[PDB]
């Protein structure tokens, strides 16, 4: 939600199958296209929910 | 002993094996979170 | 995470016991005369 309140979705970060998720990209991004190469680093890309966009666009 | 005439062979074909393993594994994937709680 | 300490063996036997049942039955079907 773009308010610097990160939601944990992955198994290794404390989730089980029922609670786990790939979390949607940041509200600060909005509808902006956020590929890996728009981030300064993978660490930034991950914080802002880059995986969600890559996955849903390739999936669709 | 004289043989029992009521015996019958039992079968599980390969598709049934695959279906059954899928059922078990998916049920495990589903209930395991609740077993760990 | 503070999970149930029996969750691992519960899940393991939940998978193994019925899976093994099916594998026993499948393999002895294949070994029957064709």
């Amino acid at each position: 939600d773009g308010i610097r309140e990160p939601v944990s979705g992955s198994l290794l970060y404390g989730n089980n199958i029922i609670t786990g998720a790939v979390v949607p990209s940041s509200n600060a991004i909005g509808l902006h296209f956020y590929p890996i190469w728009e981030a300064a680093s993978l660490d930034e890309w991950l914080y802002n929910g880059g995986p969600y966009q890559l996955i849903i666009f390739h999936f669709l | 002993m004289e043989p029992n005439p009521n015996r019958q062979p039992v079968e599980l074909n390969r598709t049934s094996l695959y279906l059954g393993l899928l059922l078990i594994l998916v049920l495990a994937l589903l209930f395991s979170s609740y077993f760990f709680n | 995470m503070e999970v149930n300490q029996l969750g691992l063996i519960a899940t393991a036997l939940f998978v193994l016991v019925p899976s093994v049942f099916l594998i026993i039955l499948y393999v002895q079907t294949e070994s029957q005369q064709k």
Partner: peptide, 30 residues
Amino acid sequence: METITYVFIFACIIALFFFAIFFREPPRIT
């Protein structure tokens, strides 16, 4: 331990998909 368990079950399912497709009983017309 929980993560290993979840990923293990998932990996078995993916393996099962592979055998169920490529090592299925072949359909045969009789």
